[PDB]
Design a protein around this nucleic acid. Structure first.
Lengths: 143, 142
DNA sequence: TAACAATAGCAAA
DNA sequence: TTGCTATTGT
């Protein structure tokens, strides 16, 4: 019960933010921003409406349109009319977009590996065990 | 390995769950979690909107909204930079520093609760190890 | 005929 | 940025 406890939590918070910043930069190698990547992730398992996209990531509708426009011009997704109500527009991922998405996943996995490089396989297991308990408690609380 | 990826995935889950609960609890002080983070950043000196948006990885507009709320509640104020009077720096007020302090109490209580299954030693061990993860991310971010 | 979606072109001030 | 407004499709 020391100030070390709040330090663990704010360090975890700092890691999330820094990782997000670094992943965003590395995604630039595929000409994608982190959001562009998230739109591809969301459409990877099926077409989605613009509203679903905006709500899904708590982002403005406009930000979603810009991302889609960029992805469309890059041939990563296409706007298509909803077959059940052709007045609606769905964002559908293309084969290229799907392959670009998978490369984004590889970039993430590589970064995630790199970042824990100073830890041995045993330290990794130990850490995972400890923070998994932290996860369990916060989820029980914030249910 | 997958365990290494699992660490980052678990950290992500913890952050999202913690952010959600902190937003709920900080509401007691009429603060959002982001408002709190803005206060936290300006507690040690004035900061620019761009700076705030980058550090917490959020849109610059979100910072604006947060800032407006904080300013109206008289927790922060926008003042011209002595270096360049055309660049606005977000400065915190004594009231904001006192409000921030109350936010730390809430944060500390949740932190103690959430790490409750960990002994003092385990805490030191976890903290040392994840501190290395963060330091590693920063070296690579240069 | 009316109503519901989306979009491009005009406003706001 | 938001918020109409006229127009094309369902």
């Amino acid at each position: 019960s020391n100030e070390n406890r709040i330090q663990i939590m704010s360090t975890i918070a700092k890691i999330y933010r820094a990782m997000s910043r670094e992943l965003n930069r590395r995604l630039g190698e595929l000409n994608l921003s982190y959001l562009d990547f998230l739109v591809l992730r969301a459409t990877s398992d099926g077409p989605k409406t613009m509203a679903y996209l905006a709500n899904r990531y708590f982002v403005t509708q406009s930000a979603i349109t810009a991302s889609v426009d960029k992805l469309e011009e890059m041939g990563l997704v296409v706007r298509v009319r909803d077959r059940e109500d052709r007045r609606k527009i769905l964002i559908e991922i293309t084969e290229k977009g799907l392959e670009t998405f998978n490369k984004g996943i590889e970039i993430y996995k590589k970064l995630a590996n790199e970042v824990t490089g100073d830890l041995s396989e045993d330290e990794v297991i130990l850490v995972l065990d400890k923070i998994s308990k932290i996860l369990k408690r916060i989820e029980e609380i914030s249910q």
